[PDB]
From Swiss-Prot, chain A:
The modification N6-acetyllysine is found at residue 15. Transmembrane segments: none annotated. Belongs to the peptidase M16 family. UQCRC1/QCR1 subfamily. Expressed in brain, including substantia nigra, striatum, cortex and cerebellum, and in spinal cord, heart, kidney, liver and muscle. This is Cytochrome b-c1 complex subunit 1, mitochondrial. Component of the ubiquinol-cytochrome c oxidoreductase (cytochrome b-c1 complex, complex III, CIII), a multisubunit enzyme composed of 11 subunits. The complex is composed of 3 respiratory subunits cytochrome b, cytochrome c1 and Rieske protein UQCRFS1, 2 core protein subunits UQCRC1/QCR1 and UQCRC2/QCR2, and 6 low-molecular weight protein subunits UQCRH/QCR6, UQCRB/QCR7, UQCRQ/QCR8, UQCR10/QCR9, UQCR11/QCR10 and subunit 9, the cleavage product of Rieske protein UQCRFS1. The chain holds residues 234 to 282 of 480 of the full protein. It comes from the Eukaryota. It comes from Homo sapiens (Human). It is linked to Parkinsonism with polyneuropathy: An autosomal dominant disorder characterized by late-onset, levodopa-responsive parkinsonism with asymmetric tremor, rigidity and bradykinesia. Patients also manifest a sensorimotor polyneuropathy with variable degrees of distal legs and hands muscle atrophy and weakness, and absent deep tendon reflexes. It is found in: Mitochondrion inner membrane. Component of the ubiquinol-cytochrome c oxidoreductase, a multisubunit transmembrane complex that is part of the mitochondrial electron transport chain which drives oxidative phosphorylation.
UniProtKB/Swiss-Prot annotation, chain B:
This is Cytochrome c1, heme protein, mitochondrial. Residues 39-48 are mitochondrial matrix. The chain crosses the membrane at residues 5-38. It is linked to Mitochondrial complex III deficiency, nuclear type 6: An autosomal recessive disorder caused by mitochondrial dysfunction. It is characterized by onset in early childhood of episodic acute lactic acidosis, ketoacidosis, and insulin-responsive hyperglycemia, usually associated with infection. Laboratory studies show decreased activity of mitochondrial complex III. Psychomotor development is normal. It is found in: Mitochondrion inner membrane. It comes from Homo sapiens. Component of the ubiquinol-cytochrome c oxidoreductase (cytochrome b-c1 complex, complex III, CIII), a multisubunit enzyme composed of 11 subunits. The complex is composed of 3 respiratory subunits cytochrome b, cytochrome c1 and Rieske protein UQCRFS1, 2 core protein subunits UQCRC1/QCR1 and UQCRC2/QCR2, and 6 low-molecular weight protein subunits UQCRH/QCR6, UQCRB/QCR7, UQCRQ/QCR8, UQCR10/QCR9, UQCR11/QCR10 and subunit 9, the cleavage product of Rieske protein UQCRFS1. The gene is CYC1.
Length: 49, 48
């Protein structure tokens, strides 16, 4: 953002970021989950503070 | 000598059933309130 013109940034991006692999190596896929929320608590001390 | 015998046996029957119902519940409530202390861990972490 700022003084950048979009098409310059894109045409420039093609010459450098285009070398990044796109098809997954080993076809790896991350496995996200709707993770749980515990009701626990932690209570560290050090009374001199 | 004991006119109230029958009514006493009746209430006795009612109370046993009543207490038989109440004890597991209240004890379970105690287990519930105390479970956080029964299960809690604690550790010791000196700075060095
Ligand atoms: C519903 C199930 C039955 C409910 C039983 C109600 C009886 C409650 C009782 O009297 O215990 C004291 C109870 C305290 O429970 P607690 O000390 O917090 O239990 C310890 C924790 O559970 C943590 O200690 P814990 O690890 O020992 O807890 C385990 C134990 C709980 O530990 C205890 O304190 C024993 C009391 C409950 C087990 C008794 C089994 C009787 C059936 O309960 C069990 O799970 C034992 C399982 C045995 C199963 C029986 C085997 C064949 C089936 O409440 C009282 O203090 C009242 C006592 C004073 C009464 C006044 C007397 C009148 C005069
Ligand atoms: C005034 C202020 C006084 C406040 C007193 C509050 C006391 C609360 C203690 C409760 C513990 C009782 C545990 C179980 C008792 C029970 O289930 O008794 C029921 C049973 C029902 O009998 P029926 O007359 O045939 O039924 C008519 C319709 N219900 O009553 C009885 O027979 C037992 C009576 C003895 C109760 C004594 C409680 C006094 C404690 C205080």
């Amino acid at each position: 953002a700022g003084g950048v013109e979009h098409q310059q940034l894109l045409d420039l991006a093609q010459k450098h970021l285009g070398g990044i692999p796109w098809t997954y190596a080993e076809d790896a896929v991350p496995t996200l989950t709707p993770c749980r929320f515990t009701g626990s608590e932690i209570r560290h001390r050090d009374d001199a503070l | 000598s004991e006119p109230e015998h029958d009514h006493r046996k009746r209430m006795g029957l009612k109370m046993l059933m009543m207490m038989a119902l109440l004890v597991p519940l209240v004890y379970t409530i105690k287990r519930h309130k105390w479970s956080v202390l029964k299960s809690r861990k604690l550790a010791y972490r000196p700075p060095k």
